[PDB]
Amino acid sequence: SDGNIELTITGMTCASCVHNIESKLTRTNGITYASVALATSKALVKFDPEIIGPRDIIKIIEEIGFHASLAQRNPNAHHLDHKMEIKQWKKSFLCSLVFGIPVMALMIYMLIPSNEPHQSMVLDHNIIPGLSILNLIFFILCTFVQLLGGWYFYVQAYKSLRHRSANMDVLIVLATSIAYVYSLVILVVAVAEKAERSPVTFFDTPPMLFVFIALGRWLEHLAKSKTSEALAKLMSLQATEATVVTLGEDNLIIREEQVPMELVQRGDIVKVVPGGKFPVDGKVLEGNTMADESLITGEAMPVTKKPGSTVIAGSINAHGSVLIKATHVGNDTTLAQIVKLVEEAQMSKAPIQQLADRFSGYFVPFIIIMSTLTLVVWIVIGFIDFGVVQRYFPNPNKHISQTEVIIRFAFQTSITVLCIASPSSLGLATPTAVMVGTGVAAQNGILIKGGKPLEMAHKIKTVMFAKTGTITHGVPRVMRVLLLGDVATLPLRKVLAVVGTAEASSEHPLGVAVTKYCKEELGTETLGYCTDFQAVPGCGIGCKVSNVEGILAHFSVLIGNREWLRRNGLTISSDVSDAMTDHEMKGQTAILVAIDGVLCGMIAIADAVKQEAALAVHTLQSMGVDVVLITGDNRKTARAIATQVGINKVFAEVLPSHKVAKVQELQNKGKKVAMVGDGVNDSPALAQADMGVAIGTGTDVAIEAADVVLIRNDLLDVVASIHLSKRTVRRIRINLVLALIYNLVGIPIAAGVFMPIGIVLQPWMGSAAMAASSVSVVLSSLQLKCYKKPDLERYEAQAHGHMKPLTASQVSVHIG
Ligand SMILES: Nc1ncnc2c1ncn2[C@@H]1O[C@H](COP(=O)(O)OP(=O)(O)NP(=O)(O)O)[C@@H](O)[C@H]1O
């Protein structure tokens, strides 16, 4: 309700660029939140609508120097495929190689002298005093490769400098330009005084630098493209066309037309042939078949589909042809919001994420400053204290004096110090790891929306389990009926009929369960009238039913918890109070019966706990996370059900009205808490809950409060989600550690600090190391793809042998 927009940005190539984007867009008034993702080439901003419109924000973006636009809905193919830039990097790298090959050849020639040289290594035979032929060929290669290849980098530095920010390639432009100019001036002085010996100059480095930098950019963009495999597949999995037909009377054949997605609308009939795709989600009309959700929910067993079931737009048909009534078309499709969630996931930046953005923003300036300081220190120490340098540079060469070799060494060190920095590595260390973690999670059915839960799941120390829909399957079934009051005027069939018709309006899962049970065990699907209906959350229901004779041919009812009776002046006798205690002791919820103030009997309505709950909870508490069950049912029922799962503390008689006070009660101590809710049923609790994962929200991942979604109703998804977040955040930390230690070792090592020992790297080695690090970080992130979703037996394999027992006595409940 604040006009937030998802914006598409082009030209993003450096992390410092996006840092500039956030910095200034926050600098501009009227913007409260501004985040940009470099990897996905997109930007999302929340802005005040009336004062400023999207035109103004976009225009701010172009005056930055980048081309933006409102993100489209379907078309997002060429933005994420990365094909174009990897192809032009192929082009540039090959254009650099066709000149590096001569550099390779001359380097190998000049390094190793032959055993029996033909003419005593005449390759360096000078022609013009001070200008060796080798130096001249170096000059021509360097000049031509500069002019042609470095055009791209020069233009990038030019456009970057047109504004305040300096991107990554600018420092490479400085490296090459400084090498060029200093080599040129040394050559000019050599040819001016007509020096006998041509000097050694940095014409070797520009083409080697270009070859290795192009190779590194190619490799790292290829790896980045491999990062988006999951999102790319999900995006290019939706069918762009569908078979729409017309039905005469009995779903017969009238006519068929082939239609694209933009034209089809809701309610249309779509035919999918065997082996076909599902282009639109909808309701199954007729035709038994099977479907597979491997690419969507990451499940294994091919899900069966029958007339009246649901479908997913993207599953492959297996048997026969089936007709579907369109219910969600285009953006409505489940895959649409799945991919939307995945792509926005890399928009909610983590604390470490924004720290990395900050550092990378002020990194290239830091690198250039450090390079200049290194140059200054080397030149001054040479010009003043020559004893230290001569301690390891004693070679007396009348051809080249110490005053010149020292300056040359200083320039080499300053070139290699900024040629070894990898701003790209630091910038893309975290975002790519986040992208790969989210992709693997989605491939397993886990939709970890937002990047915040990735790290915020690291610090979780308590998990709040809901009872209905999470611990239980959510399909309660009626066990047995108890009769307490009169029988003559209250025959069993009549009382069940009247109660069922009364609670027909109810939408509580147990209410619908009892409706179906009564209808099936009476055979009378019809029901009477209802008047004066109310539903107090967490207490019960009650209403007035008329037309009782409708089913009797074959009445103010009160149904709810004990609090409803005591509040309504309905005494609960000890005999009945103890009557249901037997049920509650077996972890099965029970509901009493009261009509016109007469407690006729009681009804036992319960659902078996998920068999996997015990293993999942034992693993979760062994992993080092507290577990607590939240429920609104009777305290005895919570006590019994916790036994089947072994929960130390629970919160029973927690009516949905508050349903959150206990969240704060657990939060106030500061320990992080996560809840595993249902979604729409208790969305506010998840919203307040720090890490609220929705369980079983298949085909309805459109949940706002929950920051994590499990497309499949499998409790083990929760433990898998926490464990996957653990490893993904560990990988983010590892990537940051690598991208840092690389820089803090390269800058000294490239600064020649350890040269006295005898380890000094000549310039192009710096570019090689830059490429190596910038690709190694991405490979480390890609390693996350090698994740195997642990299966049932796997968890108890490590948990087997220690299922710590506990009786109801050693179990806690809510206080007050
Ligand atoms: N349809 C109903 N008829 C009679 N009583 C009901 C009905 N629905 C709820 N109640 C009463 O209100 C209480 C609320 O139950 P409920 O809050 O759904 O427990 P839960 O297992 O924690 N499910 P949830 O609210 O999703 O966490 C029930 O225990 C009953 O005592």
Curated annotation (Swiss-Prot):
Copper ion transmembrane transporter involved in the export of copper out of the cells. It is involved in copper homeostasis in the liver, where it ensures the efflux of copper from hepatocytes into the bile in response to copper overload. It comes from Homo sapiens. Monomer. Interacts with COMMD1/MURR1. Interacts with DCTN4, in a copper-dependent manner. Interacts with ATOX1. Interacts (via C-terminus) with ZBTB16/PLZF. Changing residue 475 to I: In WD; copper ion transmembrane transporter activity. Changing residue 78 to Y: In WD; uncertain significance; no effect on protein abundance; no effect on protein localization; no effect on copper transport activity. Changing residue 597 to S: In WD; uncertain significance; no effect on copper transport activity. The chain holds residues 562 to 1405 of 1465 of the full protein. Changing residue 780 to L: In WD; uncertain significance. Changing residue 470 to A: In WD; uncertain significance. Each HMA domain can bind a copper ion, they are tightly packed and closely interact with each other. Wild-type ATP7B can usually be loaded with an average 5.5 copper atoms per molecule. This is Copper-transporting ATPase 2. Changing residue 266 to P: In WD; uncertain significance. Changing residue 55 to W: In WD; decreased copper transport activity; increased ATPase activity; does not affect interaction with COMMD1. Changing residue 698 to S: In WD; yeast complementation assays show that the variant mildly rescue iron-uptake deficiency of yeast mutant ccc2. Changing residue 503 to K: In WD; loss of copper transport activity; loss of ATPase activity. Residues 115-136, 185-203, 382-411, 752-762 are extracellular. The modification Phosphoserine is found at residue 809.
